[PDB]
Design an enzyme around this catalytic site. Sequence first.
Site, PDB file in Angstrom:
ATOM      1  N   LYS A   1       1.780   4.891  -1.249  1.00 23.70           N
ATOM      2  CA  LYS A   1       1.044   6.056  -1.808  1.00 23.70           C
ATOM      3  C   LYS A   1       1.432   7.384  -1.086  1.00 23.70           C
ATOM      4  O   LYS A   1       1.932   7.302   0.031  1.00 23.70           O
ATOM      5  CB  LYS A   1      -0.488   5.829  -1.787  1.00 23.70           C
ATOM      6  CG  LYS A   1      -1.073   5.666  -0.390  1.00 23.70           C
ATOM      7  CD  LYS A   1      -2.467   5.123  -0.451  1.00 23.70           C
ATOM      8  CE  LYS A   1      -3.096   4.970   0.898  1.00 23.70           C
ATOM      9  NZ  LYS A   1      -4.564   5.143   0.775  1.00 23.70           N
TER      10      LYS A   1
ATOM     11  N   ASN B   1       0.962   7.977   2.644  1.00 19.48           N
ATOM     12  CA  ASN B   1       1.836   7.135   3.477  1.00 19.48           C
ATOM     13  C   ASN B   1       3.313   7.592   3.459  1.00 19.48           C
ATOM     14  O   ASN B   1       4.145   7.017   4.174  1.00 19.48           O
ATOM     15  CB  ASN B   1       1.772   5.672   2.996  1.00 19.48           C
ATOM     16  CG  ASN B   1       0.482   4.947   3.236  1.00 19.48           C
ATOM     17  OD1 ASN B   1       0.355   3.805   2.840  1.00 19.48           O
ATOM     18  ND2 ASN B   1      -0.509   5.556   3.892  1.00 19.48           N
TER      19      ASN B   1
ATOM     20  N   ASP C   1       0.808  -1.235   0.000  1.00 21.11           N
ATOM     21  CA  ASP C   1       0.000   0.000   0.000  1.00 21.11           C
ATOM     22  C   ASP C   1       0.872   1.331   0.000  1.00 21.11           C
ATOM     23  O   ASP C   1       0.676   2.242   0.792  1.00 21.11           O
ATOM     24  CB  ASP C   1      -1.065  -0.025   1.118  1.00 21.11           C
ATOM     25  CG  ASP C   1      -2.108   1.068   0.996  1.00 21.11           C
ATOM     26  OD1 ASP C   1      -2.493   1.408  -0.160  1.00 21.11           O
ATOM     27  OD2 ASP C   1      -2.537   1.595   2.046  1.00 21.11           O
TER      28      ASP C   1
END
Length: 378
Positions: free
Chosen positions: A190, A193, A188
């Site tokens: 992105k 983050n 995950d």
Amino acid sequence: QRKLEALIRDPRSPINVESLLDGLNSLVLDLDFPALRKNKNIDNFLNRYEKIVKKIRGLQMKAEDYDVVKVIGRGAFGEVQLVRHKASQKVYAMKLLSKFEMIKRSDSAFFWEERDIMAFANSPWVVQLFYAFQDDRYLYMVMEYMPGGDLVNLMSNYDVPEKWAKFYTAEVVLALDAIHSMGLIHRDVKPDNMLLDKHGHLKLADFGTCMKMDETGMVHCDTAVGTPDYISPEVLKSQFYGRECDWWSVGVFLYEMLVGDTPFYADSLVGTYSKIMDHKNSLCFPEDAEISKHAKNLICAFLTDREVRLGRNGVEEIRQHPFFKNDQWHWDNIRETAAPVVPELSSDIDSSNFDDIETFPIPKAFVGNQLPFIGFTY
Ligand SMILES: O=C(NCc1cccc2c1OCCO2)c1ccc(-c2ccncc2)cc1
């Protein structure tokens, strides 16, 4: 006996003092209800311990020990808050995960990896975890605060030139390389983050999706986990892949930073999904946006199928790409060099780089809602 008293000391151990105390608080929590207190056994055990347990409760770290400055994030199972530890006056960011929503929504196991990464990675690229604690309601993760904000904010406040994109891409590539070498796959990655520190240097967060690789350096997970705009096609197709699914996210990241939009942006959720799956035909750079031939080559190098994606063979093929040619840093010192945006901070609780932002049913039979969270305290 050798490993026994060693494991009581060991911070990575399931039978250390924090876990043994977690098990006691949990037991007290789960049982103290008149409906169950009818039972003689539940009554005498509660009699002996409730008074001492209540006393540890306060003697241990509580949410009460912190002044909640502001809320800087909000996720599926809770919120991230900007906090200050009352006694020490020390500022941290505290992530909260709702126990009720982790049982109601089936998923209540992701946090183990999240905690362990942050707790023990000891990497400049990973946000550090100082304390992990809990209560009847939540799971609390006390981390090193990132006053620089996220790259969602940076992009919204700037026209990102290729000189800046060179730096942030390089910092992300080394960050994911450190995550990968621990035998982990982000799944995950992105801008939401990617966080910036005091000096404007990148650190990754939200290690919830993260999975331990096999001896093959692969993961057998027949479920699509991540965020629409940044998910790779192979993970949509997963609903047996390698760490190359994280390099796809880097392609999307660079495209967004340069163009101003994600390369597969669609009106609907299934629209983006369908765009990604047809990346060969849906991906195209808009004319008015002046992207170099080197920047275009690299977005294209990652935004392909996993069988030909840059990075499939290691970080070295990424590092040597002509796009990363610059007069400011090297792969061996980016973090020692001056970042493109150094954040101006008014205070230790300055939250200017961040945008402005459940009752469990009393039982009549033993449920054991606290059992999956025994061992969380660190
Ligand atoms: O994981 C994060 N957010 C996602 C998130 C938040 C809450 C519940 C979630 C969830 O994701 C899926 C499960 O439910 C995260 C974001 C930012 C920071 C941070 C660190 C230091 N300084 C400032 C901010 C730390 C963590």
